[PDB]
């Protein structure tokens, strides 16, 4: 006879899809940096990975809860980092600016003299400072008597220069009883079954760069540059491209800016651009042709696989932010043309750039900042690792802006969080005495 | 020998008097209201499933510390929720005012003040309507007024992105504890209960705030009920509870508009605009006979202890305390009650005043400025109790005492108790 009876196993390998928060881990002057001890366990390792066989799982980068979870965490800390910094309200005053009109006659710059409340709460002082034209708006057709570009909606904090902007690698860890599955296919799709899967306790190092129209320092495909979108037939949805061959980009400000400290109030300071040393020139980016051309030819070669004649078109127009590659070069926020790249159909090529100190930097309009200048020459090398593309519906693809969380979807597409259910019950011939 | 050995049982019905923190539960659009269900733990609205027999327990609602830890926690939540919206520090400026005047009524002032525009370089004189209760004099000639609270605190506006409308609140004990529920009809607070049950969480507790009356509150099953720590002494308030409630209607028949002022950088102060439509003082309705009847009831329970009874107007104090103050429609009220407790043993009007600046609690270190709600206001609620006091030919008057006595009208039945699941007794059994 069969003589089968219930048997309980504790610790069988089965998992269930679930949503939970992952505590942050990171690599290694007080308060140091944005990713300091305030939020993450410092300088923990990049530990082993658990290999799996004969397992199949269906991940979904667009329904993944890690992306939505992470976006609010970036905002929460970035708001926390700027809590103690000075509120820039006392700077709201009419500025007696005039043309820069100073040799070592630059375009896009101004010289402004404005009143200030000094250390004492009495007596003015005619302090002065340079200002980029993008951070300042004229009040009269005459042109004189300028005003800051942000004071009418909401005055916002200065970024304290003592805390660094650098995006040190970050690792996300699951709590005990939960596991982070990882897909490993060479040509993963972003949706559907993974025939090759693994799992790890903490994710690999994400470098949380903030950028638009170009992902930098991000992950890379093994080969065969990949395409990822909610539905390629749809157009309003964003298309994320991740490269395989990185193309090097060098961005620089050749000028030697001096930092001027303005005692804007009792115990308060407002840093601003000072007198300029050395030769004077506009900033720019360097990206090598024959490598972007190979890169752009490639993606087009894999774009046409889902369109049975492809065209790359200039930015969508409108606000300077969404229309422009907007990244941070280690302490200053750069806005770079990009119209010279996305003009093609199927040596060096340079892009001129513009700096904006008064920035919002979120699609969420409930925040603002003032990034103080970085004295001295600044240059930052980087890899372009992905593109954002948008479609109107023979296709023309514009460099894409859109929602900010699309950047994080480029790094976290491999991962899914799964709840462990170790209890298992099955019949067996055994019988309790 | 008697051959007895110790026997241990896990799950025995034994419980111990205990004090511990509790966690909120509530019924099921962002930022909703101050009593946030997104701050509480929704948990479950229907625990039920209980019954008990043959148990007797001793309750003391006058020393039920469940209310005290709840008392402070409720203030902590309200204090916490006012963090994100503005401080009215810039509103402290000398106010030049004129009569409300025709286009002719009073109790308001056409007060104008200087305020900074988008740039510090430039300023503008705004104008608004303020109630006289929000303002005090500086020069006896009749101008250059001052705001009431500026010499004590920089007040916070009640920014309307989160409201005060109260939802029912269920109070749950943590794992390892239970709440004993005294279940009799005439259980007057203290002493041995004889019909008792328990439950994981209490029923819907209305977080109401009022003085001299209890609104939307609990009801005794039948026959009015009275509770007091002592009756011979007259120091502490006596709580009356009504099984037969009486409706109270309030109204502000004025289509008062809302005026926005750019008081600070990115901060929007709210002030009264022009009045539209007719003009009337705010007043409340309670029906004669319907209301007068309940005082004939309460007199019986007073004289069940005291060997005729008279009810008289408020004993005395500031306008904060000599009044029935309550919230209706989001705008606070401070009303009279002298037209009701004026009897010895058609709707009768209670005309009264509104305030924007409030403190409520005896603590003066915190202030709240409630902006006006556009349009006419009206609301209906159930009166279910009083907060009377003894004078000691013996009369009574409607007292308010400190705030926390409002809670005890809702928590008198509930006592939190720890569970001791283990018990040991001798038995003839033995380990093999």
């Amino acid at each position, epitope marked *: 006879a069969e003589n089968l009876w219930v048997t309980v196993y504790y610790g069988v390998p089965v998992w269930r899809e679930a949503d939970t928060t992952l505590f942050c881990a990171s690599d290694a002057t007080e308060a140091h940096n944005v990713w300091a001890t305030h939020a993450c366990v410092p300088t923990d390792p990049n530990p082993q990975e658990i290999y799996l066989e004969n397992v199949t799982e269906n991940f979904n980068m667009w329904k993944n809860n890690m992306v939505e979870q992470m976006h609010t965490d970036i905002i929460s800390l970035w708001d926390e980092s700027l809590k103690p910094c000075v509120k820039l309200t006392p700077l709201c005053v009419t500025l007696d600016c005039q043309a820069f009109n100073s040799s070592s006659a630059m375009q896009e710059m101004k010289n402004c003299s404005f009143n200030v409340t000094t250390e004492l709460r009495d007596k003015k002082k005619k302090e002065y400072s340079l200002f980029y034209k993008l951070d300042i708006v004229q*009040i*009269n*057709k*005459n042109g004189r*008597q300028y005003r800051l570009i942000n004071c009418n909606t909401s005055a916002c904090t200065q970024i304290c220069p003592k805390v660094s902007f650098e995006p040190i690698p970050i690792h996300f860890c699951a709590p005990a009883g939960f596991a982070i599955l990882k897909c490993n296919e060479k040509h993963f799709n972003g949706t559907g079954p993974c025939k090759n899967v693994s799992t790890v306790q903490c994710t690999h190092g994400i470098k949380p760069v903030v950028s638009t129209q170009l992902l930098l320092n991000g992950s890379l495909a093994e080969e065969e540059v990949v395409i990822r979108s909610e539905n390629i037939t749809d157009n309003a949805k964003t298309i994320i491209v991740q490269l395989a061959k990185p193309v090097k980009i060098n961005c620089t400000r050749p000028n030697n800016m001096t930092r001027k400290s303005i005692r804007i109030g009792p115990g308060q300071t407002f840093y601003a651009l000072g007198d300029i040393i050395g030769n004077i020139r506009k900033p720019y980016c360097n990206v090598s042709k024959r490598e972007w051309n190979n890169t752009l030819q490639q993606v087009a070669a894999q774009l046409r696989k889902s369109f049975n004649t492809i065209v790359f078109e200039k930015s969508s127009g409108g606000d300077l932010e969404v229309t422009t590659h907007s990244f941070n070069c280690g302490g200053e926020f750069f806005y770079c043309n990009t119209s010279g790249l996305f003009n093609s159909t199927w040596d060096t090529i340079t892009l001129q750039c513009r700096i904006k100190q008064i920035i919002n930097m979120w699609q969420r309009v409930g925040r603002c900042m003032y990034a103080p200048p970085i004295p001295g020459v600044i240059r930052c090398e980087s890899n372009i690792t992905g593109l954002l593309l948008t479609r109107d519906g023979n296709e023309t693809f514009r460099p894409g802006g859109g929602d900010m969380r699309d950047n994080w979807r480029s790094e976290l597409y491999k991962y899914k969080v799964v709840q462990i259910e170790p209890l298992g019950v099955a019949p067996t011939h055994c019988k309790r005495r | 020998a008697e051959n007895l050995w110790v026997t241990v049982y896990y799950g025995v019905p034994v419980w111990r008097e205990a004090d511990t923190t509790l966690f909120c539960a509530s019924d099921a659009t962002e930022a909703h209201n101050v009593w946030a269900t997104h701050a509480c733990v929704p948990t479950d609205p229907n625990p039920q499933e209980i019954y008990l027999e043959n148990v007797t327990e001793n309750f003391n609602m006058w020393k039920n510390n469940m209310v005290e830890q709840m008392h402070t926690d409720i203030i902590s939540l309200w204090d916490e929720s006012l963090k994100p919206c503005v401080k009215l520090t810039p509103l402290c400026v000398t106010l030049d005012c004129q009569a409300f005047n025709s286009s002719a009524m009073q109790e308001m002032k056409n007060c104008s003040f200087n305020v900074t*525009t988008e740039l510090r*370089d*430039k*300023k*503008k004189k705004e104008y608004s309507l303020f109630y006289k209760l929000d303002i005090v004099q500086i020069n006896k000639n009749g101008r250059q007024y001052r705001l009431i609270n500026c010499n004590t605190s920089a007040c916070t506006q009640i920014c309307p992105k989160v409201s005060f409308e109260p939802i029912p609140i269920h109070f749950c004990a943590p794992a390892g504890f239970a709440i004993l529920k005294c279940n009799e009809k005439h259980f007057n607070g203290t002493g041995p209960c004889k019909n008792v049950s328990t439950v994981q969480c209490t029923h819907g507790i209305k977080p109401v705030v009022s003085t001299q009356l209890l609104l939307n509150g609990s009801l005794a099953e039948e026959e009015v009920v009275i509770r007091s720590e002592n009756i011979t002494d007259n120091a502490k308030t006596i709580i009356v509870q009504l099984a037969k409630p009486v409706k109270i209607n309030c109204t502000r028949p004025n289509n008062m508009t809302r005026k926005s002022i750019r008081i600070g950088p990115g901060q929007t102060f709210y002030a009264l605009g022009d009045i539209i439509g007719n003009i009337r003082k705010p007043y409340c309705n309670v029906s004669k006979r319907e209301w007068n009847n309940t005082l004939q009831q309460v007199a019986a329970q007073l004289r069940k202890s005291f060997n005729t009874i008279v009810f008289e107007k408020s004993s005395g104090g500031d306008l904060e305390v000599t009044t029935h103050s309550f919230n209706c429609g989001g705008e606070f009220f401070y009303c009279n009650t002298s037209g009701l407790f004026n009897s010895t043993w058609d709707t009768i009007t209670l005309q009264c005043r509104i305030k924007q600046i409030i403190n409520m609690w005896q603590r003066v270190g915190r202030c709240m400025y409630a902006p006006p709600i556009p349009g006419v206001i009206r609301c209906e609620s159930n009166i279910t109790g009083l907060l009377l006091t003894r004078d000691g030919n013996e009369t009574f008057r409607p007292g308010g005492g400190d705030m926390r006595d409002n809670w005890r009208s809702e928590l008198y039945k509930y006592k939190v108790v720890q569970i001791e699941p283990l018990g040991v007794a001798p038995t003839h059994c033995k380990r093999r």
Partner: antibody
Framework: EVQLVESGGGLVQPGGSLRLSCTFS????????MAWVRQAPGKGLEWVSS????????DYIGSVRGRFTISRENAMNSLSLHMNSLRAEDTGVYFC??????????????????????????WGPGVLVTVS | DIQMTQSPSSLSASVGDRVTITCRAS??????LAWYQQKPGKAPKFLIY???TLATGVPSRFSGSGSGTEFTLTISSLQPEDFATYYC?????????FGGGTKVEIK
């Protein structure tokens, strides 16, 4: 010196929306209130409306209340009277005039105020408006 | 409402003569009264404010009796550039209104 110009006036049928525009050819427009003054042929000047430098204290004469609309755009140094629902009795020359520059009462930090100080310091050449 | 009027309607004078123009108000205004000159074929010009203070560009032959309410404008000597229409206004409170105006002519 401060100088001004008007444009847009002409002849339009009754009940029209013949708008008027004034331009400010000078500095410091940020702190000038402005007004329009009407003048029927042979009759005295009649005040039409006024708008402060900050555009927060617009005011009108009762004879045109609810009809007229006065607006300005500091970003382009201009004053726009978006007049609507004209009638024949509105015929008469129109002058754009600027109130005196806002008072300066330095007490604590900088202090520019926003009165409608009703002194019409300078007048533009004027533009005709006729309705028939 | 502040009704305003001037008297007499017009006066006669010649170059070199002293001139006087009177302006009266029904309601009381402390000192907030001003005057204008309107040369025909041109928009008005600014003469006096606060009832005694001269304009920036006025040649100082003019003076205003800035006291009481019998406000009056006087010219020490008459010159042809002053031979034009005149207006008085109250700027105490809105709505603003100008009197009927007055004109000068040869004597």
């Amino acid at each position: 010196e401060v100088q001004l110009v008007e444009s847009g006036g002409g002849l339009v049928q009754p009940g029209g929306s013949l708008r008027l525009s004034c331009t400010f050819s000078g500095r410091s427009y940020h702190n000038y209130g402005m007004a329009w003054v009407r003048q029927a042929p042979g009759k005295g000047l009649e005040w039409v409306s006024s708008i402060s430098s900050g555009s927060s204290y617009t005011d009108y004469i009762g004879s045109v209340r609810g009809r007229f609309t006065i607006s300005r755009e500091n970003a382009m140094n201009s004053l726009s009277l978006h007049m609507n629902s004209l009638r024949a009795e509105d015929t008469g020359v129109y002058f754009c005039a600027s109130q005196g520059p806002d008072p300066w009462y330095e007490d604590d930090f900088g202090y520019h105020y926003e009165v409608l100080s009703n002194r019409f310091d300078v007048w533009g050449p004027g533009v005709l408006v006729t309705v028939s | 409402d502040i009704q305003m009027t001037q008297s007499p309607s017009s006066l006669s004078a010649s170059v070199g003569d002293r001139v006087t123009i009177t302006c009266r108000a029904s309601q009381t205004v402390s000192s907030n009264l001003a005057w204008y000159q309107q040369k025909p074929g041109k928009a008005p010009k600014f003469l006096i404010y606060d009832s005694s203070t001269l304009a920036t560009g006025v040649p100082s032959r003019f003076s205003g009796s800035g006291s009481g309410t019998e406000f009056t404008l006087t010219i020490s000597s008459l010159q042809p550039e002053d031979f034009a229409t005149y207006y008085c206004q109250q700027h105490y409170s809105r709505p603003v209104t100008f009197g009927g105006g007055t004109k000068v002519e040869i004597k």
